[PDB]
A paper describes a structure:
To gain insight into how DNMDP induces complex formation of PDE3A with SLFN12 and how trequinsin inhibits this interaction, we solved the high-resolution crystal structure of a modified form of the catalytic domain of PDE3A (PDE3ACAT-Xtl) in the absence or presence of DNMDP or trequinsin. PDE3ACAT-Xtl is comprised of residues 669–1095 with two internal loops between residues 780–800 and 1029–1067 replaced with shorter linkers to aid in crystallization and improve diffraction quality of the crystals. The catalytic domain of PDE3A crystallized as a dimer with two dimers in the asymmetric unit. In the DNMDP-bound structure, DNMDP binds in an extended conformation with the dihydropyrazidinone ring buried deep in the active site pocket. This orientation is stabilized by hydrogen bonds with H961 and Q1001 and a series of hydrophobic interactions along the length of DNMDP. Indeed, the melting temperature (Tm) of PDE3ACAT increased by +3 °C in the presence of DNMDP, indicating that DNMDP binds and stabilizes the structure of PDE3ACAT. However, they do not reveal how DNMDP promotes SLFN12 binding, as DNMDP does not cause any obvious structural changes in PDE3A. We hypothesized that the interaction with SLFN12 is stabilized by contacts with the exposed diethylamino group of DNMDP and inhibited by the trimethylphenyl group of trequinsin.
DNMDP and related compounds, or velcrins, induce complex formation between the phosphodiesterase PDE3A and the SLFN12 protein, leading to a cytotoxic response in cancer cells that express elevated levels of both proteins. PDE3A is a well-characterized cyclic nucleotide phosphodiesterase (PDE) that hydrolyzes cAMP, cGMP, and cUMP8,9. Here, we show that PDE3A and SLFN12 form a heterotetramer stabilized by binding of DNMDP. Moreover, we demonstrate that SLFN12 is an RNase, that PDE3A binding increases SLFN12 RNase activity, and that SLFN12 RNase activity is required for DNMDP response.
Numbering used by the authors:
A (entry chain B): 669 to 780, 799 to 808, 812 to 1028, 1068 to 1093
B (entry chain A): 669 to 778, 800 to 1027, 1069 to 1093
Write the structure that this text describes.
């Protein structure tokens, strides 16, 4: 049972691709090809680099062996399925790191907590890492790594409709997300070889665990409109986001992991088209099982009647679009001032270009 | 491998106690003595009587063997602990049946079932069973029977503080209540011998399961103040409770199971004192394990320094009192026109509260 990290913990021949981590369109499929498909090390190698970039090993006296042991066991428990795999976990962790470390035009630093900064971070700009304490940031990064742990390649709706043992176990409520959090935490506690949090006190550890669970459970898209309405409520109230309020910080971390989780349509066309391929291939596996069980095939999941452009157009218009508008309205989107100044925002620019590409595909069909 | 209901499905020797089900202070400990203390049939025998009283077997074409098979398997998986046992499950089912079937002064009433006990044909009474469709009522009754299934005799706080497997499995959220619902439903789906819902269509069955889970999860007292504030909100808004609104009906069913679950302090002194003895004895078992694990003993859980009166006074003042006041303000409390209203349930709660305050005054 004690899966341990490969002998040379840090792989070391990957420097030329790893130095591109500080870009939004990090070429993650070129990293996969450089490491080796199913070498099972992409998540632990990127986790190492981003924890070191933030000085999180010093801040919490994290021993590197136990940390690499855990992140390797975690990445090994992600299945070989087309989308909800360790490559997606790596992508989401990169996205949360990018959203929390990169310059945000006109964001104020909380006047007055222990805070970490990226080595990449060097009046007119702030970053979330300057407003969210190191403990809470580390919880968000670990949540991103564990968020899809042991994903079966089926939706909550499918597990509930088929009375899958997991759906009965979790009373049909956030079935996958409860399982990811519970299975990742059970893995963590199963062996002292995994205990990278040994230097947190008991109060800190219980708070850390609470924050990780809240972040993973926030990735259930059945709650998507509830989180977005709650967040628009906090932004448009008397004081706006209050960075000294622990519940306001939690809600920002949850919006951050939610955006990170569905970042694909807001990447360059090349990345977005590869992730689109991944999710529709996982849907077709589900559509095949639905047919074999005599259920009707869910919309967009029938390989012999694809509606790929309709899926991505409506995903962008109903889910990704409103989440980005809400996050941008809070003033939390990384961007650059244009030389009542305007902001150039790469993330919304990509989402707009991808939306237009899918509408153009629809108008031909 | 399947637990099956005992030889003659219905015990014939219980008639003189079973006819007293239509009283608030049902002598449940006399029923225990008449059956035998761990005979393990009390929940299935009472469930049969209350389902037959409401004509629920005819309304959903329930096969009685599968129904008795399931309720016997369920009652067997309640542990021999002092409070959260099959006797408590029986008590809560009786209380939800009583609150939903018995006359309510000035309640308006319209796929509905009615108790054979419901006589009193004065215009000026209704019952909730006249306002809550039979499918939703049956969900509330089955939830009451399953609400504490496989209870370990420990609080959520103890399971979370000790990183018990169940607390890890449920991410520290409503750990016991998720387990009761999940373990009860797993038992149901485990055997065709248990499928008493076979004549519900697929839409009905999915709705039924949703309602049962919502009712069991509502018994977590971490949510108590949220439910009470939400209910007072719906009662004091422009239209009040709207019986044609499915979310208003669910919230009434959840207030009903919540009151049924903590009914003890609103029973006659004799019943209330036996239930109080049960809960403090279960707490002491928890305090013993806390000491052995080197944890500080939780408040009220120390056998060598009991604080029974302080426990019950503050439980009634903080939890039971405000829930009864809120349910009574909605006009949903069973009672009799004297015209003012005599309400047995609130009169018992007031008398038991005064009894504990008087005990404290000596200590
Ligand atoms: C129903 C939402 N959903 C299932 C979990 C989903 C997940 C991810 C993506 C997805 N689409 N485009 C990408 O670039 C990659 C991911 C974010 C799309 C959907 N969807 O059903 O539409
Ligand atoms: C606070 C909730 N609780 C422990 C889970 C509890 C349950 C039942 C009773 C109990 N009190 N009085 C009775 O008559 C029987 C039951 C409801 C009391 C408590 N409590 O901690 O106060
Ligand atoms: Mg997920
Ligand atoms: Mg309970
Ligand atoms: Mn994900
Ligand atoms: Mn109970």
């Amino acid at each position: 049972k004690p899966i341990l990290a490969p002998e040379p913990l840090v792989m070391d021949n990957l420097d030329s691709i790893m130095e591109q981590l500080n870009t939004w369109n990090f070429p993650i499929f070129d990293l996969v090809e450089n490491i080796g498909r199913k070498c099972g090390r992409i998540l632990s190698q990127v986790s190492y680099r981003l924890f070191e970039d933030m000085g999180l090993f010093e801040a919490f006296k994290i021993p590197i062996r136990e940390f690499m042991n855990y992140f390797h066991a975690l990445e090994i428990g992600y299945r070989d399925i087309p989308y909800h795999n360790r490559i997606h976990a790596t992508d989401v962790l990169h996205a949360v790191w990018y959203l929390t470390t990169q310059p945000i035009p006109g964001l104020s630093t909380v006047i007055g907590g222990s805070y970490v900064f990226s080595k990449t971070y060097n009046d007119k700009y702030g970053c979330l890492s300057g407003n969210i304490p190191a403990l809470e940031l580390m919880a968000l990064y670990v949540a991103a790594a564990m968020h899809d742990y042991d994903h079966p390649g089926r939706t909550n709706a499918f597990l509930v409709a088929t009375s899958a043992p997991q759906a009965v176990l979790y009373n049909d409520r956030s079935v996958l997300e409860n399982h990811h959090a519970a299975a990742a935490w059970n893995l963590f506690m199963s062996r002292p070889e995994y205990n990278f949090l040994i230097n947190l006190d008991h109060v800190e550890f219980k708070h850390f665990r609470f924050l990780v669970i809240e972040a993973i459970l926030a990735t259930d898209l059945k709650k998507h409109f509830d989180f977005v309405a709650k967040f628009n409520g906090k932004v448009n109230d008397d004081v706006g986001i209050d960075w000294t309020n622990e519940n306001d910080r939690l809600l920002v971390c949850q919006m951050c992991i939610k955006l990170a989780d569905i970042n694909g349509p807001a990447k360059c066309k090349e990345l977005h088209l590869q992730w689109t391929d991944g999710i529709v291939n996982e849907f077709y596996e589900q559509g095949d099982e639905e047919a074999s069980l005599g259920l009707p095939i869910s919309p967009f999941m029938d390989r012999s009647a694809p509606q790929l452009a309709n899926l991505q157009e409506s995903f962008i218009s109903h889910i990704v679009g409103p989440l980005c508008n809400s996050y941008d309205s809070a003033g939390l989107m990384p961007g650059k001032w244009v030389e009542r100044r305007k902001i150039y925002c790469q993330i919304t620019q990509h989402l707009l270009q991808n939306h237009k590409m899918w509408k153009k595909v629809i108008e031909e069909e």
